């Protein structure tokens, strides 16, 4: 099955998922001098006051916090987006070392990790239909660097002991994802893909310019998760990131100059 190892990693995914070599694949490198400032872009609308976290899960490739997306409780709108997108889940991608782990890169800079808040477009009724659409998903990507701790992440960090291995899950209610945001909502945006199988080219990517800082103790707790399931040889869940893909016929736009 696909993964991040030597024989099943990103260079192998195209065999089961040919779109891996597609025309709008993610992640990409964001060349900050090539990105064009688009003043017709709008401020992002991040409406997370009514979010309903449900459960946290080790899915064998990352850990995920899922929300109630049966109503417009936590939505993203504005920016380059038409319509309302509902928050389904967030997860991260991270490294074995602080100099690597993000999927997007900024002028080839790799961040220690990248947070992905996954939203689907309500005009398509469910996430399974959205992923079949060129504008089906909006993913808000936030870079993590190692520095001061991020207080809003500590509730997540403290429960990872209970979901160490693949397919473990736990209650995770009343978590407020507003605690993971930076101060600025300035962003880059381009049309792209899921960065894990099926690599569907359904994503409007919205990548915030500003990292959040997390502590070394917080990120070290990511690195104690396992790719494997209980009763299997231990393999630490590190370097679960896809590297940058060719931009091809695409222009990265910036909401800021």
Ligand X SMILES: NS(=O)(=O)c1ccc2o/c(=N/O)[nH]c2c1
Annotated active-site positions, please? Answer: 61
Tokens matching residue 104: 């997007």
Site track 107-136 with Zn ion (rule: CB under 5 A), x = hit: ---------x--------------------
Other beta carbons within 10 Å of 172: 20
- Please say whether the beta carbons of 142 and 182 come within 8 A: yes
User: Any contact of residue 116 with ligand X (CB under 6 A)?
Assistant: yes
Smallest gap, in angstroms, from Cβ of residue 140 to ligand X? 9
Smallest gap, in angstroms, from Cβ of residue 118 to ligand X? 5
- Please say whether the beta carbons of 144 and 201 come within 8 A: no
Residues 121-140 that bind ligand X (CB under 6 A): 139
Closest among 116, 67, 121, 60 to 90, alpha carbons compared:
116
- Please say whether the beta carbons of 219 and 112 come within 8 A: yes
Site track 37-76 with ligand X (rule: CB under 6 A), x = hit: ----------------------------------------
Smallest gap, in angstroms, from Cβ of residue 160 to ligand X? 18
User: Any contact of residue 194 with ligand X (CB under 6 A)?
Assistant: yes
* Binding-site member from 196, 204, 226, 245 for ligand X (CB under 6 A): 196
**What is the spatial distance between Cα 250 and Cα 241, in angstroms, rounded to a whole number?**
22
Q: Which stretch binds ligand X (CB under 6 A): 34-42, 105-113, 169-177, 190-198?
A: 190-198
User: Any contact of residue 195 with ligand X (CB under 6 A)?
Assistant: yes
First to last CA, the chain: 43
User: Any contact of residue 30 with ligand X (CB under 6 A)?
Assistant: no
Q: Which distant-in-sequence residues (6+ apart) come within 8 Å of 158 by Cβ?
A: none
- Please say whether the beta carbons of 198 and 216 come within 8 A: no
Tokens matching residue 122: 């309500």
| Binding stretches for ligand X (CB under 6 A) | 116, 118, 139, 194-196, 198, 203
């Amino acid at each position: 099955h696909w993964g991040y190892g030597k024989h099943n990693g990103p260079e192998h995914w195209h065999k089961d998922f040919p779109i891996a070599k597609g025309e709008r694949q993610s992640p990409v490198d964001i060349d900050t001098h090539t990105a064009k400032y688009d003043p017709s872009l709008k401020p992002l609308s991040v409406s997370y006051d009514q979010a309903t976290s449900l459960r946290i899960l080790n899915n064998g490739h990352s850990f995920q916090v899922t929300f109630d997306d049966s109503q417009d409780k936590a939505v993203l709108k504005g920016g380059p987006l038409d319509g309302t997108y509902r928050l389904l889940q967030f997860h991260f991608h991270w490294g074995s070392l602080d100099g690597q782990g993000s999927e997007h890169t900024v002028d080839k800079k790799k961040y220690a990790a990248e947070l992905h808040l996954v939203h689907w477009n309500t005009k398509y009724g469910d996430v399974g239909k959205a992923v079949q659409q060129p504008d089906g998903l909006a993913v808000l990507g936030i870079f993590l660097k190692v520095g001061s701790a991020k207080p809003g992440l500590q509730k997540v960090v403290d429960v990872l002991d209970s979901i160490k291995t693949e397919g473990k899950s736990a209650d995770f209610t009343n978590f407020d994802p507003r605690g993971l945001l930076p101060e600025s909502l300035d962003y880059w945006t381009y049309p792209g893909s899921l960065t894990t199988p099926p690599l569907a080219e359904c994503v409007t990517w919205i990548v915030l310019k500003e990292p959040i800082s997390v502590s070394s103790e917080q990120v070290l707790k990511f690195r104690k998760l396992n790719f494997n399931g209980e009763g299997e040889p231990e393999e630490l869940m590190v370097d679960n990131w896809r590297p940058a893909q060719p931009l091809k016929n695409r222009q990265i736009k910036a909401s800021f100059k």
